[PDB]
Enzyme design. Structure first.
Site, PDB file in Angstrom:
ATOM      1  N   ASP A  18      68.732  35.265   5.349  1.00 20.77           N
ATOM      2  CA  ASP A  18      68.738  34.467   4.134  1.00 20.77           C
ATOM      3  C   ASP A  18      67.365  34.033   3.655  1.00 20.77           C
ATOM      4  OD1 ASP A  18      70.075  33.223   1.985  1.00 20.77           O
ATOM      5  OD2 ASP A  18      70.154  31.308   3.079  1.00 20.77           O
ATOM      6  N   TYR A  59      73.186  24.817   6.962  1.00 18.83           N
ATOM      7  CA  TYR A  59      74.300  24.253   7.725  1.00 18.83           C
ATOM      8  C   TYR A  59      74.264  22.727   7.685  1.00 18.83           C
ATOM      9  CZ  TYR A  59      74.078  29.036   9.503  1.00 18.83           C
ATOM     10  OH  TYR A  59      74.022  30.410   9.586  1.00 18.83           O
ATOM     11  N   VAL A  71      71.458  19.023   6.563  1.00 21.88           N
ATOM     12  CA  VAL A  71      70.353  18.400   5.864  1.00 21.88           C
ATOM     13  C   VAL A  71      69.058  18.517   6.653  1.00 21.88           C
ATOM     14  CG1 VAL A  71      69.670  16.346   4.608  1.00 21.88           C
ATOM     15  CG2 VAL A  71      72.063  16.793   5.054  1.00 21.88           C
ATOM     16  N   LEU A 128      55.757  21.781   8.142  1.00 21.70           N
ATOM     17  CA  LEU A 128      54.767  22.372   7.232  1.00 21.70           C
ATOM     18  C   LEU A 128      54.913  21.555   5.963  1.00 21.70           C
ATOM     19  CD1 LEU A 128      55.232  24.807   9.330  1.00 21.70           C
ATOM     20  CD2 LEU A 128      54.129  26.184   7.580  1.00 21.70           C
ATOM     21  N   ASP A 160      64.218  28.438   8.727  1.00 22.45           N
ATOM     22  CA  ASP A 160      65.668  28.388   8.575  1.00 22.45           C
ATOM     23  C   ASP A 160      66.398  29.717   8.731  1.00 22.45           C
ATOM     24  OD1 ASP A 160      68.010  27.038   6.137  1.00 22.45           O
ATOM     25  OD2 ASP A 160      67.977  26.899   8.316  1.00 22.45           O
ATOM     26  N   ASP A 170      56.986  24.328   0.547  1.00 24.08           N
ATOM     27  CA  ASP A 170      57.696  25.598   0.610  1.00 24.08           C
ATOM     28  C   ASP A 170      57.238  26.448  -0.561  1.00 24.08           C
ATOM     29  OD1 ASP A 170      59.335  25.215  -1.777  1.00 24.08           O
ATOM     30  OD2 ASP A 170      60.658  23.956  -0.574  1.00 24.08           O
TER      31      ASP A 170
HETATM   32  N1  LIG Z   1      59.661  23.228   9.175  1.00 23.04           N
HETATM   33  C1  LIG Z   1      59.917  22.819   8.001  1.00 23.04           C
HETATM   34  N2  LIG Z   1      58.985  22.096   7.280  1.00 23.04           N
HETATM   35  C2  LIG Z   1      59.471  21.783   6.102  1.00 23.04           C
HETATM   36  N3  LIG Z   1      58.756  21.089   5.285  1.00 23.04           N
HETATM   37  C3  LIG Z   1      58.792  21.034   3.995  1.00 23.04           C
HETATM   38  C4  LIG Z   1      57.878  20.135   3.364  1.00 23.04           C
HETATM   39  C5  LIG Z   1      57.839  20.032   1.955  1.00 23.04           C
HETATM   40  C6  LIG Z   1      58.719  20.829   1.167  1.00 23.04           C
HETATM   41  S1  LIG Z   1      58.643  20.733  -0.590  1.00 23.04           S
HETATM   42  N4  LIG Z   1      60.163  21.000  -1.285  1.00 23.04           N
HETATM   43  O1  LIG Z   1      57.754  21.768  -1.039  1.00 23.04           O
HETATM   44  O2  LIG Z   1      58.113  19.439  -0.985  1.00 23.04           O
HETATM   45  C7  LIG Z   1      59.636  21.717   1.777  1.00 23.04           C
HETATM   46  C8  LIG Z   1      59.676  21.823   3.182  1.00 23.04           C
HETATM   47  S2  LIG Z   1      61.077  22.348   5.790  1.00 23.04           S
HETATM   48  C9  LIG Z   1      61.138  23.065   7.357  1.00 23.04           C
HETATM   49  C10 LIG Z   1      62.222  23.773   7.892  1.00 23.04           C
HETATM   50  O3  LIG Z   1      62.182  24.135   9.068  1.00 23.04           O
HETATM   51  C11 LIG Z   1      63.352  24.075   7.128  1.00 23.04           C
HETATM   52  C12 LIG Z   1      63.235  24.674   5.819  1.00 23.04           C
HETATM   53  C13 LIG Z   1      64.397  24.970   5.057  1.00 23.04           C
HETATM   54  C14 LIG Z   1      65.685  24.681   5.578  1.00 23.04           C
HETATM   55  C15 LIG Z   1      65.819  24.099   6.863  1.00 23.04           C
HETATM   56  F1  LIG Z   1      67.030  23.834   7.340  1.00 23.04           F
HETATM   57  C16 LIG Z   1      64.661  23.793   7.643  1.00 23.04           C
END
Ligand SMILES: Nc1nc(Nc2ccc(S(N)(=O)=O)cc2)sc1C(=O)c1cccc(F)c1
Length: 294
Positions: free
Chosen positions: A123, A15, A17, A79, A141, A82
């Site tokens: 999703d 929804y 960024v 975190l 998410d 992903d």
């Molecule tokens: N909690 C949380 N932490 C994240 N960190 C993170 C750190 C590094 C990487 S990465 N591409 O591996 O470098 C990806 C995520 S995202 C996230 C979300 O809650 C979230 C995830 C997706 C969509 C959304 F709307 C919220």
């Protein structure tokens, strides 16, 4: 926001960024999702509030929800990586089966938990499964269409991934069941094992037909009622089911048996998260720690 210092953009949620941010006062590092004018539903925020009281080790904690300024901010525990990036980083060698098994086991616990609380993710995909140095993996998410909606865009021209979408959704079912999450997780499981997306569809129909080409075009025998679904067409090509041993080589039989049950066409035959946790595939499950390059 104002009490936050954007460290960097993490991506595009469902929804809006997502930013890595630091609470300018508490110093805590969080993931901040910025949403979107109309005015934001009440039926939404309340389905969101439910998400706040959803505490489980395999669910990303939603810390705060701020509506102010015609924009919705969701503050989540942060975190570092992903599953998408981790899988890419592990593409050459592949993720060790014990780790794949541990991640699948934990995600099923997470789902067993939300599902018993009548909460659907809707999703699941590698980009919304987050891992830490600890060997944990958490659901992030949640897309609850009951907490908002399932649009054709995140918010500003983004190609929605259909690779993990359950067939009943593609066929026009109006009411999703918890089974849609098991399907998505099954697709993810296969992808960790083979290091290739199971059903990489580029359009809704291509997604559907790739599923059909692999699992066989469904009929009333394997899926009672399928031919009565909103988007079902008698004109669909009729593909035979492919040998399953060709689908996820070289996953052992316990793993293939479990995946098979997560990928049943009939939502009512598809295995529940609770039952999947009891599958023999997990008899030797352990919690290894991943080699994370942050
Ligand atoms: N909690 C949380 N932490 C994240 N960190 C993170 C750190 C590094 C990487 S990465 N591409 O591996 O470098 C990806 C995520 S995202 C996230 C979300 O809650 C979230 C995830 C997706 C969509 C959304 F709307 C919220």
């Amino acid at each position: 926001m104002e009490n936050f210092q954007k460290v960097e953009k993490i991506g595009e949620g469902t929804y809006g960024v997502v930013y890595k941010a630091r609470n300018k006062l508490t110093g805590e590092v969080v993931a901040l999702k910025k949403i979107r004018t109309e005015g934001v539903p009440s039926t939404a925020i309340r389905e969101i509030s439910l998400l706040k009281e959803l505490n489980h080790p395999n669910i990303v904690k939603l810390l705060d929800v701020i509506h102010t300024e015609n924009k919705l901010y969701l503050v989540f525990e942060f975190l570092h990586q992903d599953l998408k990036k981790f899988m890419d980083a592990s593409a050459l060698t592949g993720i060790p089966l014990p780790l794949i098994k541990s991640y699948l086991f934990q995600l099923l616990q997470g789902l067993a938990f939300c599902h018993s609380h009548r909460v659907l993710h809707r999703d699941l995909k590698p980009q919304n499964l987050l891992i830490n140095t600890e060997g944990a993996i958490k659901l992030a998410d949640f897309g609850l269409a009951r907490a908002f909606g399932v649009p054709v865009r995140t918010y500003t021209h983004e190609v929605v991934t259909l690779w993990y979408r359950a067939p009943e959704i593609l066929l026009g079912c109006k009411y999703y069941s918890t089974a849609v999450d098991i399907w998505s997780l099954g697709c993810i499981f296969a992808e960790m094992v083979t290091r290739r997306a199971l059903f990489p569809g580029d359009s809704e129909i291509d997604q559907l037909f790739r599923i059909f080409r692999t699992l066989g075009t469904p009929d009333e025998v394997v899926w009672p009622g399928v031919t009565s679904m909103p988007d079902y067409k008698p004109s669909f090509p009729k593909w035979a089911r492919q040998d399953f041993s060709k689908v996820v080589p070289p996953l052992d039989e316990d793993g293939r048996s479990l995946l098979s049950q997560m990928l049943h066409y009939d939502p009512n035959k598809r295995i529940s998260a609770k039952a999947a946790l009891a599958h023999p595939f997990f008899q030797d499950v352990t919690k290894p720690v991943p080699h994370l390059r942050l």
